[PDB]
């Protein structure tokens, strides 16, 4: 058995720099005539692909920016320069002994400049109001870093019952993040107060992100 304790668990490397994804192994020797392994990539918005075979060779379909080498246990995956195609999880696989397990997985994050999110609020549809429900969504997309917290504040009192968030990972190409905050309530809650407030606090926006929506938006 080979325990590929790949490290680190995640990286924050900006564009144009050198990212280092190490991969620790225990066994074995003489893969083909040496102690090399294969590297792979698993993107969140695209199927996976093979980057480096035998840890020293290039593969068609991917750029030549991926390189590296490795000893019996100390392996290295060098991505130099980092462009906007690297936001994904990287793995290392030994094939000289069953099971052909992979590494722990290094989630490389493209450390671009800080960017504020978009602003878009969607009142409920006619079918929702007809059925008595009212689900409002306050989207905050195209931002960096992923650290974002939405506070659904109704003018009467802050509501935190039906608050759900969808934290989308960094797309392979689009280096920005995307998060959607929902609030599923009844029609009486939507018709409770004239105005409402979608509050949020992001690292980029020093001022509190505030966008209101009225009950008459139908």
């Amino acid at each position: 058995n080979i325990v590929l304790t790949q490290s680190p668990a995640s990286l924050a490397v900006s564009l144009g720099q050198r990212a280092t994804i190490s991969c620790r192994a225990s066994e074995s020797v003489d893969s083909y005539g040496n102690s090399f392994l294969h590297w792979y990539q698993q993107k969140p918005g695209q199927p996976p692909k093979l980057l480096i075979y035998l840890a020293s060779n290039l593969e068609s379909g991917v750029p030549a920016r991926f390189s590296g080498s490795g000893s019996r246990t100390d392996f290295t995956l060098t991505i130099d320069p980092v462009e906007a195609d690297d936001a994904a999880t990287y793995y290392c696989q030994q094939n000289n002994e069953d099971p052909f397990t992979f590494g722990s997985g290094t989630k490389l994050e493209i450390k671009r400049a800080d960017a504020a999110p978009t602003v878009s609020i969607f009142p409920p549809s006619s079918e929702q109001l007809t059925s008595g429900g009212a689900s409002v969504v306050c989207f905050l997309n195209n931002f960096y870093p992923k650290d974002i917290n939405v506070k659904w504040k109704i003018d009467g009192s802050e509501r935190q019952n039906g608050v759900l968030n969808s934290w989308t990972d960094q797309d392979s190409k689009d280096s920005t993040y995307s998060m959607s905050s929902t609030l599923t309530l009844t029609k009486d809650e939507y018709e409770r107060h004239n105005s409402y407030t979608c509050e949020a606090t992001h690292k980029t926006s020093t001022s509190p992100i505030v966008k209101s929506f009225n009950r008459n938006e139908c």
């Binding site: 696989q93 992979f102 997985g105 959607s180 929902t182």
Partner: protein
């Protein structure tokens, strides 16, 4: 040219079995051994097994007694039979072509196999339509709220996938035996409310197609 996508399972309870059908294309089954893996269920990527070229097959130490590979050389399809699955095994299962040094050169799209004691439920789609008081600045964002479905996946597109500029797919929020999926797409203002817009939602687990006009 190459296709290694999976299909067949919809929903399975824990401690049960299933059957997956992976359609192989682009290479003959006698030329390469189709591999079989998962998609990061918690910890790192997990390897399951591989059927060699007309010979025996290797399996994982933790899945040799439970999981099995059934390779059909006549139909150009590799079938997989799993047994005694747990909720933690929920992940996308992939098929891949054998390389030179036992590598996985090609990778497919796979299928999101979900293990959970809950029962199947179709999606109750409700569109996220801006009201009449909604404003616009050279563009308008649109989306849908697909709540009340189980299990994953569910594909939300804009007019059968006509739009691809600002399409953003969000993860499903695990509810009590249900899921909640949101979406957000960016389209210029000349398409809505001018042209006909409709949310297209597909649930491959139940093969349901829900159309809701935005």
């Amino acid at each position: 040219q190459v296709q290694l996508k999976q299909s067949g399972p919809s929903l399975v309870q824990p401690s049960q079995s299933l059957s997956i059908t992976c359609t192989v294309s682009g290479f003959s089954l006698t030329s390469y051994g189709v591999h079989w893996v998962r998609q990061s269920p918690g910890k790192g990527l997990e390897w399951l097994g591989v059927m060699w070229r007309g010979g025996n097959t290797d399996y994982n130490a933790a899945f040799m007694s439970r999981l099995s590979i059934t390779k059909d050389n006549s139909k150009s399809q590799v079938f997989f039979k799993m047994n005694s699955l747990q909720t933690d095994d929920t992940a996308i299962y992939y098929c891949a072509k054998n390389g030179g040094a036992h590598a996985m050169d090609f990778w497919g799209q796979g299928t999101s196999v979900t293990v959970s004691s809950a029962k199947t439920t179709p999606p109750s789609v409700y569109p996220l339509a801006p009201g009449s008081a909604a404003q616009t600045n050279s563009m308008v964002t649109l989306g849908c709220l697909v709540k009340g479905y189980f299990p994953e996946p569910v594909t939300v597109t804009w007019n059968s996938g006509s739009l691809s500029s600002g399409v953003h797919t969000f993860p499903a929020v695990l509810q009590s035996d249900l899921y909640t999926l949101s979406s957000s797409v960016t389209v210029p203002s000349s398409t809505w409310p001018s042209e006909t817009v409709t949310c297209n939602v597909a649930h491959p687990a139940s093969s349901t197609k829900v159309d809701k006009k935005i």
